[PDB]
Amino acid sequence: DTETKEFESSESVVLNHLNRYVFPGSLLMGNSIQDLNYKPVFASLNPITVSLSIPAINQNTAITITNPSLSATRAAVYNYLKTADFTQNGQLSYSIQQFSSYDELKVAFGSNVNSRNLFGKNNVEEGMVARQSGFYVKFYQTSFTLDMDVPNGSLVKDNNFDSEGIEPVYVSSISYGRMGILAIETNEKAEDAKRIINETFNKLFYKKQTNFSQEEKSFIEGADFNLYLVGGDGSTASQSFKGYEAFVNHVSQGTFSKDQPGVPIFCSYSYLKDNSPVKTKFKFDIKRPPLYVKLVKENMKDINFNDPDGGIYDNKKEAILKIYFYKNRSLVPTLPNPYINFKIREKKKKWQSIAPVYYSSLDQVPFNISERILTKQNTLQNIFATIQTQDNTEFSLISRIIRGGGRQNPVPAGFRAIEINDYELVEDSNYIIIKD
């Protein structure tokens, strides 16, 4: 049981192991950019004119690459920056979004990249956020950008090239600098997590401060972090840590220079055919995670109405039945999923006799048995739900035993009436029962 999700991207995050294919005019297979399995198309390329923008200082220029290539692009940029003003920290930006599956981070990367495998995932719970709440933070510093002009005709010189009948594409714009995508898992509630996360990032990443409150410090020390960073310091896979000082080192601004001016962090593509912009429509399915339910008795009351002078002892046991919902076996609370019908079995054991019957055990009583199933639905407002079994009360009778021999032989023995109700969850295809 999955959830299909569709998004469209005109821009892709450049993974650390692929930045060699990302430069202005880089000609690639039209079917190799969606899964980041870049396949260069070998062709003779014409000169290109690209606009170099340093948005942190609000400056722009125009460099020319006669023979498009990564080396010519590196040489062109440096030989401009070595004579011009540049930036140390670039243009900062971050965006905070909640997520439940690491497959949803595909959208943050703007491609059909195996995001869960990239973040160390890959039951379906393996690719699911474990703690109460999950948020990812896409933060980046843009040092400079390269944006091609529309070619005057074709970017290619000769149409004699092997693209395997696939209409090729070429890298038409690139943004350079440093980018991280930080997954955060907190047992805190989402409203509080989102606020604490925004507050701590405006402090460290933006303002470079570290005067966190104890609330924010406790959030950091108790949160699970998993970062994928694109940069000179970037790994090919994510990195899972759990530390404040580790949090402060990683979320901190990076530095740029004329010798290290930033790596390709995201890029856009055009078609070689008509020089039109490229946009991909993606579709991925999120396997719905399981629902765990536990039946519990609460507000339990054991009442004894005893008449030792008349040899009658009435013991009534009661409780409020309650089902609790969880997203995993670690009892992380969750709001129930819509349209699940929670089923509770009531097995009743009833017996009575006008005259005391001296059974040595309740396993000897000839009980009259009856069973029914209660059904609870539409409970999507709380991480638990009360199970009503009677009229005019949230309490359910667990036990009701009256015994005794009467005024004559006023012993606490014999049996006059027994009613015993046993309760359990009924197996369903939409939830897994947890019974202690």
Numbering used by the authors: 77 to 198, 203 to 516
Give the authors' words.
A recently found family of pore-forming toxins, called CDC-like proteins (CDCLs), are wide-spread in gut microbes and are a prevalent means of antibacterial antagonism. Analysis of the CDCLs belonging to the phylum Bacteroidota revealed the presence of sets of two-component CDCLs, one long CDCL (CDCLL) with four domains and one short CDCL (CDCLS) lacking the fourth C-terminal domain, that act as a bicomponent complex via a mechanism only previously observed in the mammalian complement MAC. Unlike CDCs, the CDCLs require proteolytic activation with both components containing a proteolytically cleavable activation loop critical to the regulation of pore formation. Here, we present the crystal structure of a proteolytically activated CDCLL and cryo–electron microscopy (cryo-EM) structures of a prepore-like intermediate and the transmembrane pore.
We determined the crystal structure of act-EaCDCLL to 2.49-Å resolution, revealing the absence of electron density for the D2 β1 strand and its preceeding N-terminal extension, consistent with the MS results above that the peptide dissociates from the protein. Overll, the crystal structures of pro- and act-EaCDCLL superimpose closely, except for differing orientations of domain 4 (D4) with respect to the rest of the domains (33.5° rotation around y axis, shift of 1.4 Å on both x and y axes). We attribute this to altered crystal packing between the two structures and likely flexibility of the domain interface due to very limited interdomain contacts. One notable difference between the pro- and act-EaCDCLL crystal structures is the slight outward movement (1.2 Å) and shortening of the β5 strand (~15 to ~6.5 Å) in the core D3 β sheet in the activated structure. Movement of this strand in CDCs is critical for oligomerization and assembly of the prepore state. The crystal structure of act-EaCDCLL suggests that its activation loop plays a similar role in triggering structural changes that allow for oligomerization, as we observe an initial movement of the β5 strand away from the β4 strand that forms oligomeric interactions in CDCs. Previously, the C11-type protease family was identified as the proteases that activate CDCLs in vivo. This yields the act-EaCDCLL lacking the activation loop and preceding N terminus that also displays movement of the β5 strand away from the CDC-like β4 strand oligomerization interface. Thus, this experiment shows that the D4 of CDCLL is necessary for membrane binding and recruiting CDCLS to form the pore.
